[PDB]
Amino acid sequence: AVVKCKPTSPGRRHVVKVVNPELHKGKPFAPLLEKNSKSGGRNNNGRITTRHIGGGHKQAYRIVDFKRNKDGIPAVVERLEYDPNRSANIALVLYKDGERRYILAPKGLKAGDQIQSGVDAAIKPGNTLPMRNIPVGSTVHNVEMKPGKGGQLARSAGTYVQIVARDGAYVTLRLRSGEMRKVEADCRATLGEVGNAEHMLRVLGKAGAARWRGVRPTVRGTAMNPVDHPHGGGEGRNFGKHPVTPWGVQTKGKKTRSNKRTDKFIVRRRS
Amino acid sequence: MIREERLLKVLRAPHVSEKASTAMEKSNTIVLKVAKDATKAEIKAAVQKLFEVEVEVVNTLVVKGKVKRHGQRIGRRSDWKKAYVTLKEGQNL
Amino acid sequence: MKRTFQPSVLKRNRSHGFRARMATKNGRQVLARRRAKGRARLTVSK
RNA sequence: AAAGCGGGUGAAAAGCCCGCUCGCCGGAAGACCAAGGGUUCCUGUCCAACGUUAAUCGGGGCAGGGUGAGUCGACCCCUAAGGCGAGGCCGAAAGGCGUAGUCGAUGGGAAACAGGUUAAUAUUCCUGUACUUGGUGUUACUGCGAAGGGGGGACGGAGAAGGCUAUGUUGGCCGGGCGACGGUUGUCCCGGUUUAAGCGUGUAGGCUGGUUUUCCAGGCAAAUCCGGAAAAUCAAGGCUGAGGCGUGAUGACGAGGCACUACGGUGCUGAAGCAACAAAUGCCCUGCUUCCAGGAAAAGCCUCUAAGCAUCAGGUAACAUCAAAUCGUACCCCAAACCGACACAGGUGGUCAGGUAGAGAAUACCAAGGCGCUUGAGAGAACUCGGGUGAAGGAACUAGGCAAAAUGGUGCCGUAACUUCGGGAGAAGGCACGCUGAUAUGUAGGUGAGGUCCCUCGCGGAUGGAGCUGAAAUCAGUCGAAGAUACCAGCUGGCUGCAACUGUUUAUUAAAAACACAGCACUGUGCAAACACGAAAGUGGACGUAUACGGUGUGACGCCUGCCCGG
RNA sequence: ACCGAACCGACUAAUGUUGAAAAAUUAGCGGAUGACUUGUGGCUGGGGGUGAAAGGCCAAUCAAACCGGGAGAUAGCUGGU
Ligand SMILES: [Mg+2]
Ligand SMILES: [Mg+2]
Ligand SMILES: [Mg+2]
Ligand SMILES: [Mg+2]
Ligand SMILES: [Mg+2]
Ligand SMILES: [Mg+2]
Ligand SMILES: [Mg+2]
Ligand SMILES: [Mg+2]
Ligand SMILES: [Mg+2]
Ligand SMILES: [Mg+2]
Ligand SMILES: [Mg+2]
Ligand SMILES: [Mg+2]
Ligand SMILES: [Mg+2]
Ligand SMILES: [Mg+2]
Ligand SMILES: [Mg+2]
Ligand SMILES: [Mg+2]
Ligand SMILES: [Mg+2]
Ligand SMILES: [Mg+2]
Ligand SMILES: [Mg+2]
Ligand SMILES: [Mg+2]
Ligand SMILES: [Mg+2]
Ligand SMILES: [Mg+2]
Ligand SMILES: [Mg+2]
Ligand SMILES: [Mg+2]
Ligand SMILES: [Mg+2]
Ligand SMILES: [Mg+2]
Ligand SMILES: [Mg+2]
Ligand SMILES: [Mg+2]
Ligand SMILES: [Mg+2]
Ligand SMILES: [Mg+2]
Ligand SMILES: [Mg+2]
Ligand SMILES: [Mg+2]
Ligand SMILES: [Mg+2]
Ligand SMILES: [Mg+2]
Ligand SMILES: [Mg+2]
Ligand SMILES: [Mg+2]
Ligand SMILES: [Mg+2]
Ligand SMILES: [Mg+2]
Ligand SMILES: [Mg+2]
Ligand SMILES: [Mg+2]
Ligand SMILES: [Mg+2]
Ligand SMILES: [Mg+2]
Ligand SMILES: [Mg+2]
Ligand SMILES: [Mg+2]
Ligand SMILES: [Mg+2]
Ligand SMILES: [Mg+2]
Ligand SMILES: [Mg+2]
Ligand SMILES: [Mg+2]
Ligand SMILES: [Mg+2]
Ligand SMILES: [Mg+2]
Ligand SMILES: [Mg+2]
Ligand SMILES: [Mg+2]
Ligand SMILES: [Mg+2]
Ligand SMILES: [Mg+2]
Ligand SMILES: [Mg+2]
Ligand SMILES: [Mg+2]
Ligand SMILES: [Mg+2]
């Protein structure tokens, strides 16, 4: 729920937090945890390639089943869990044959539910079907691009992908950007919007909260020196320049997509 | 088996000092200067077979060199090993 | 005041030691230069 | 931070040695280490040079001695970040990345304590009592086996309380004393009242339902193991665990007393060796409660089987024997030995943590212990430095209350505009405070013996209050100029610019109104993402997927954000 | 969040300025459960890194480190001859 903090300190005055009572409170599933080390935005040459990444809390990776390949076996949704690696919550689900998995939690799914994957599965949230079997007009998530590859679209909290057409071997999906994309009809997709929509209503309230999530501060080019940024310099506050990225490319309006390989699949841009 | 070649090479010299004499007259221990690459088993076998006595245990330590000056020319006296050999109450070298 | 030399034998040997000199190709050039000069001590190990 | 005197040695003593005083530190200026150094450690001798003076002295010269490990640390097994990297992908050459592997602690992994001894080492030597791992050989039973499956190792922040211990105080007991000057056989004074690891028992506390069948799309194949499903049956079963107690210990240690001394210290003997109370930041506790920011890996360990061996090997349990190699161990370590060219007001990580007053690791004085800072002696000018006090005035000084002075603690009474309803606020302002007696020969509260009762029977529960400790208050009296008496310890109020705030910044003249910020808007990006590092392969973005990521500008919040597309 | 030691820092004043010190001492001062601070180790390299942005920091050196080399650069300039 969206609960506002009382202003007993200047940092806590503006804080809005999302508290979920349905989440598990114990330790997560040790067979399915893994380590990941933080990079600080540094690649194998050691240089900062992505700025403003570093620090934050230590995290463990949860192996999440995006393929949803164990088809034909009914599964009992056991519990909902906090995954620190993504916006959405995960669900520990127990299959009928004794093997446990982590999945994304769709909206409305609760503890002790029924889900099932495969071509013969029913049309209800949490169930995974190929989009040749999924009826048109229906909202899905965790959508694949290639058959058997794994889910890649509508994976953050509260997002969904709407199937608008089916023309032969391809279906047209309207994506949360507003984008119409043709994808193969053999690709899998799980019904229902992803949960944790209230995730967008959070207010961090302080720079400390940002640093806990692991983002270093951002310095404006107009505050830099001329040698550092194309915007830097001036006595007082001077700009007089067209807005560019630190490497010199214009940053307000200039389109940067160039992929003639997938221009054939893109039907309409996000406008 | 440790060869007689090896034993006759590893035992170097006796050691004389106030502490060595006190060890001899108190704990039935002899103090031997020993070549550096000799181990405890080699020292024990060499003493036991050359001095015709019997050894309880042996304790080793490496004595470090000393930096000396000979007419404003710096030099370095070398290392050696020292062995405290304990005998079984009835040998009395 | 904290000065620039805070010594450590491990970091000294991993930085300027003989095995690091032989590990990099230009370190072997450094050893060639020092041997051709005739240094008593090539690297920091001795 | 501070010295004075007597004796000794010597050619010579302010500085060396010994003694008696005096002063300083005592969450350090004490004790032990890691890092770093390398003989500076101890003894004998010397005073050329070094020591900001002298030198008989030294961390100086010279010579000799000194560092003893199955249990401490390294080495070793195992991994993190990261390094190297057979083949490989890539690149004019050199080389870049990287799979299998293999290194890499700052982390995980078996085991020793007390007393004694040397001029210099000791958890290493000696005495006493223990513990661990591995190989061999007998005995008894037996399905053993991994590079594979499972469990475990295995993990955050904050908070709160209970139980304890280290430790301290007092009482009892034992040994000693009857005081240079009034009094001191007494409710008097000084000191001691220590004892470990290990082994046995398993308590406060914490966690979890056990036990037996049958079945299964899972755990890369198998599984008697893990998981899952269905039955039956029992209710206490298991795991963890400080402390206490017994033993170790008829032992050791012990104030002192007795005798030599090369007066430095040795040899002999040795009484009491308990209780109550207070109590940790240490232990139970890798716990419990709660929060969001969701909190290493692998081996050692336990367990299941494959291939294989199949009355063999192999495993478990007992006993005996053997082995545990090699390297460090001196000394300094908040410093005269490390980093600062110096015997340099600097810097340097962890461990221990006594008394009184105190909330306290502040502060004042002290204990254990260590020092008096390697030039002194005089004199008592100007002037400079660090302080103390000051008539009358009280900012008149000055750029400016800069500096100094002042305020300063606990309890209670009381407290405005404004406000985002939290604040402002400790607003402002005021009163009490010492000591003695009584309430009360020491109260409320805390702890709790003896005795009695009960029992699924002992480290058990109920009663019961001995004894110990002990606030706070009221009343009365009394002393001083003054009772938070020292040290320690807010100056307050009013109008206003800027930036919302906590923070960051020009190491070494600038701490700000600059930078950041949460929030806001625009814009790019459909994933082999945009973008960045890279001639490339690759990698970050991200093991993320438009409620996400990059770039740009503004900068909480409230009310708003108007017109212009000519350049 | 508040007051305040350890610890981190560096706002004001005096001293010092051939210093005790190539940046400190003394008396006050700010943070002190966090965007904290710290030990050991690793990574990023010079038109490059890193930068809560001061052209700051990269070994007492930074509007382009240090070391060797082209090199005896060049100098219509100064000094000396
Ligand atoms: Mg950014
Ligand atoms: Mg921003
Ligand atoms: Mg600027
Ligand atoms: Mg430019
Ligand atoms: Mg202007
Ligand atoms: Mg203009
Ligand atoms: Mg021994
Ligand atoms: Mg040794
Ligand atoms: Mg004298
Ligand atoms: Mg003196
Ligand atoms: Mg004296
Ligand atoms: Mg004192
Ligand atoms: Mg010497
Ligand atoms: Mg000495
Ligand atoms: Mg003389
Ligand atoms: Mg002299
Ligand atoms: Mg000497
Ligand atoms: Mg590696
Ligand atoms: Mg190769
Ligand atoms: Mg490589
Ligand atoms: Mg290894
Ligand atoms: Mg280690
Ligand atoms: Mg010593
Ligand atoms: Mg006690
Ligand atoms: Mg604490
Ligand atoms: Mg020592
Ligand atoms: Mg001195
Ligand atoms: Mg000093
Ligand atoms: Mg310190
Ligand atoms: Mg103090
Ligand atoms: Mg005077
Ligand atoms: Mg004066
Ligand atoms: Mg005064
Ligand atoms: Mg006056
Ligand atoms: Mg007056
Ligand atoms: Mg007045
Ligand atoms: Mg005037
Ligand atoms: Mg005036
Ligand atoms: Mg002032
Ligand atoms: Mg004052
Ligand atoms: Mg009273
Ligand atoms: Mg004005
Ligand atoms: Mg500000
Ligand atoms: Mg400055
Ligand atoms: Mg701005
Ligand atoms: Mg406008
Ligand atoms: Mg705070
Ligand atoms: Mg700073
Ligand atoms: Mg300043
Ligand atoms: Mg200060
Ligand atoms: Mg504050
Ligand atoms: Mg404070
Ligand atoms: Mg500028
Ligand atoms: Mg510098
Ligand atoms: Mg240049
Ligand atoms: Mg040329
Ligand atoms: Mg020239």
**Nearest nucleotide from residue A226 CA, by C1' atom:** E55
> Is the distance between the Cβ of B57 and the closest atom of strand D smaller than 7 Å?
yes
Distance C15 CA to D391 C1' (A): 76
The answer to whether the CB of A59 falls within 8 A of the CB of A36 is yes
State residue A76 phi and psi, 5-degree precision: -105, 115
Strand D proximity: list residues 223-242 of A with CB under 7 Å: 223, 229, 231, 237, 239
DSSP at A83: -
**Rounded distance between C-alpha atoms, residue A154 and residue A152, angstroms:** 7
Distances (CA, A) of B91 to A88, A94, A194, A266, B56: 83, 78, 89, 100, 11
> Is the distance between the Cβ of A46 and the closest atom of strand E smaller than 7 Å?
yes
Burial class of A93 by CB neighbour count within 10 A (0 to 12, 13 to 18, 19+): buried
**Rounded distance between C-alpha atoms, residue A254 and residue C5, angstroms:** 51
Q: Which two tokens stand for residue A174?
A: 């309207």
Q: In chain A, which ranges are E strands?
A: 2-4, 16-18, 33-35, 60-62, 75-81, 90-95, 100-104, 113-115, 128-130, 139-141, 143-144, 151-153, 161-167, 170-175, 179-184, 188-191, 266-268
Residue with tokens 């000069």: C37
**What is the residue type of A215?**
V
Owning domain of residue B56: 2-93
**How many Cβ atoms are within 10 Å of A186's Cβ, its own excluded?**
15
Cβ neighbours for C8, distance < 8 A, ≥ 6 positions apart: none
**Nearest nucleotide from residue A216 CA, by C1' atom:** E52
**What is the residue type of A50?**
T
Method: cryo-EM
Sheet containing A139-141: give its strands across. Answer: A128-130, A188-191, A139-141, A161-167, A170-175, A179-184, A266-268
Structurally, at CATH architecture level, domain A1-113 sits in Beta Barrel (2.40)
> Is the distance between the Cβ of B73 and the closest atom of strand D smaller than 7 Å?
no
Query: How many domains is chain B partitioned into structurally?
Result: 1
**Rounded distance between C-alpha atoms, residue B52 and residue B40, angstroms:** 17
Cβ neighbours for B9, distance < 8 A, ≥ 6 positions apart: B35
Residue C27: which CATH number? 1.10.287.3980
The answer to whether the CB of A151 falls within 8 A of the CB of A159 is no
Structure resolution, Å: 2.9
> Is the distance between the Cβ of A84 and the closest atom of strand E smaller than 7 Å?
no
Strand D proximity: list residues 3-42 of C with CB under 7 Å: 3-10, 23, 25
**Rounded distance between C-alpha atoms, residue B23 and residue B27, angstroms:** 5
CATH superfamily of A195-271: Ribosomal protein L2, domain 3 (4.10.950.10)
> Is the distance between the Cβ of B61 and the closest atom of strand D smaller than 7 Å?
yes
First to last CA, chain A: 33
The answer to whether the CB of A150 falls within 8 A of the CB of A104 is no
> Is the distance between the Cβ of A47 and the closest atom of strand E smaller than 7 Å?
yes
Distance A271 CA to D449 C1' (A): 90
Distances (CA, A) of C36 to B66, C39, C46: 32, 8, 18
Query: How many domains is chain C partitioned into structurally?
Result: 1
Delimit the domains of chain A by residue range: 1-113, 117-194, 195-271
**Nearest nucleotide from residue A229 CA, by C1' atom:** E53
The answer to whether the CB of B7 falls within 8 A of the CB of B46 is yes
Strand D proximity: list residues 24-53 of A with CB under 7 Å: 24-25, 27-28, 30-31, 33-37, 39, 41-53
* Three-state secondary structure string covering A7-42: CCCCCCCCCEEECCCCECCCCCCCCCEEECCCCCCE
Owning domain of residue C17: 1-46
**Rounded distance between C-alpha atoms, residue B42 and residue A138, angstroms:** 86
Residue B66: which CATH number? 3.30.70.330
